[PDB]
Design a protein around this ligand. Structure first.
Ligand code: QBW
Length: 159
């Protein structure tokens, strides 16, 4: 049995809003329900199972054509002290393409009174034979699109 491969991807978005202002949205139990009210064209559908807080499960279906089709995500952790959120893919998606573990992390870091950076990362463990296949497919795209969307929600509410 040959060693599992670990891969990390990282995206950052500078924002002219305080780390609180941006954490309040990422940590908002009602963020999940707002998601099409933020990223149209992405989702065919989005079932939510729970309160919207830690332990909530998202069933996500994308518009016919593009990969993956479906998958389920679970809110694993919110830490208001560190402004750190973790979201794990628990079923479908890449997990049917030899990925044994896929975890999104969002860290909102202060850079002075009225500004912060959104540090989004993804860590995955993949069976070494599938690395050629999945490495081109797992991109920041999803977390970049969330960082952009949240950023432009907040800058319009603060302005
Ligand atoms: O912090 C979160 C991270 C992820 C989600 C669920 C959907 N995945 C992210 C996405 C965005 C855009 C196109 C596809 C997938 C909810 C969160 O609150």
């Amino acid at each position: 049995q040959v060693s599992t491969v670990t891969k990390v991807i990282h995206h950052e978005l500078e924002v002219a809003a305080s780390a609180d202002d941006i954490w309040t949205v990422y940590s908002w139990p009602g963020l999940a329900k707002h998601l099409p009210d933020l990223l149209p064209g992405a989702f065919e559908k989005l079932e939510i199972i729970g309160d919207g807080g830690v332990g909530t499960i998202l069933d996500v279906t994308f518009v016919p054509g593009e990969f993956p089709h479906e998958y389920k995500e679970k809110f694993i952790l919110v830490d208001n002290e560190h402004r750190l959120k973790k979201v794990q893919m628990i079923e479908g998606g890449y997990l049917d393409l030899g990925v044994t573990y896929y975890m999104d992390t969002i860290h909102v870091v202060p850079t002075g009174k009225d500004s912060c950076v959104i540090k989004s990362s993804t860590e995955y463990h993949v069976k070494p034979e599938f690395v050629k296949i999945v490495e081109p497919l797992i991109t920041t795209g999803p977390l970049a699109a969330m960082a952009d969307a949240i950023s432009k929600l907040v800058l319009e509410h603060k302005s």
